Amino acid sequence: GSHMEAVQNRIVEAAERVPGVRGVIHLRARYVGQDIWADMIIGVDPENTVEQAHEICEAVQAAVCGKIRRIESLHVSAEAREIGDTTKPSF
Amino acid sequence: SHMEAVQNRIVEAAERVPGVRGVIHLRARYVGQDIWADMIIGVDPENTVEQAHEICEAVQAAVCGKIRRIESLHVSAEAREIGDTTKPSFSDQPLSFDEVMLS
Ligand SMILES: [Cu+2]
Ligand SMILES: [Cu+2]
Ligand SMILES: [Cu+2]
Numbered sequence: 001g002s003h004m005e006a007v008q009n010r011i012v013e014a015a016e017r018v019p020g021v022r023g024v025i026h027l028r029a030r031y032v033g034q035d036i037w038a039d040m041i042i043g044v045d046p047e048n049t050v051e052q053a054h055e056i057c058e059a060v061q062a063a064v065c066g067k068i069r070r071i072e073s074l075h076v077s078a079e080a081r082e083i084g085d086t087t088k089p090s091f
Numbered sequence: 092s093h094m095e096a097v098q099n100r101i102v103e104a105a106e107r108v109p110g111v112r113g114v115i116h117l118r119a120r121y122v123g124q125d126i127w128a129d130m131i132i133g134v135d136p137e138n139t140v141e142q143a144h145e146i147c148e149a150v151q152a153a154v155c156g157k158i159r160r161i162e163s164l165h166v167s168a169e170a171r172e173i174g175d176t177t178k179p180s181f182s183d184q185p186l187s188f189d190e191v192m193l194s
Pocket of ligand 2: 050075077165167
C-alpha cells in the first residue's frame with residue numbers, strides 16, 4: 001500500500017518508454033508475498049495492425065518484467081488511443 | 092474436467108460472430124456461482140486495433156448475452172490466417188484469491 005505508489009510509478013515509467021506506447025491507460029497492482037501481480041492497459045495507435053499491437057504488448061511485457069524484478073505476473077492489454085490524448089494513468 | 096459443457100457453449104457462440112476466424116484459447120472458471128473467462132479469438136491480420144476491438148465487443152455481447160452466469164469475460168484478438176484450424180486450447184485453472192482481488 002505505502003510502497004504500492006512507487007512500484008506503480010516504476011512500471012508506468014518503464015512501459016511508456018516502449019516504442020508504440022501512447023501512454024498507460026490503467027494499472028492495478030497488488031503484492032503477494034514479495035512479488036507484484038499487476039494488470040495494465042496501454043494506449044496504442046488505433047490504426048496499428050492487430051499483429052503490430054501484439055508486438056507492442058509483447059515488448060511492454062519484456063521491458064517492465066525485465067527492469068523490475070519484484071514482478072511475478074504482469075498482464076498487458078492494448079487499447080486504441082488518439083495521438084492528441086494526454087490523459088495520465090488513473091491507477 | 093467439469094468446465095467442458097460451458098467451454099464449448101462459449102466457443103460455439105464466439106465462432107458464430109462475423110469476423111472471428113476461430114477461437115484460439117479459452118479459460119473459464121467459477122468464482123462462487125459466477126463464471127470468469129478469458130479468450131483469444133483469431134481475426135484477419137490486417138484488422139486495425141479499432142476494427143478488431145469491435146469484433147471483441149461483439150464477441151463479449153454474444154457470449155455474455157447467451158450465458159449470463161458469466162460475471163467477467165476478457166476477449167483479446169490475435170492474427171490468424173483464414174486457412175488455420177487448430178481447435179481451441181482450453182484451460183480450467185482456478186483463480187487465486189489475489190487474482191480476484193486484482194479486479
Ligand atoms: Cu505471439
Ligand atoms: Cu489478456
Ligand atoms: Cu472494449
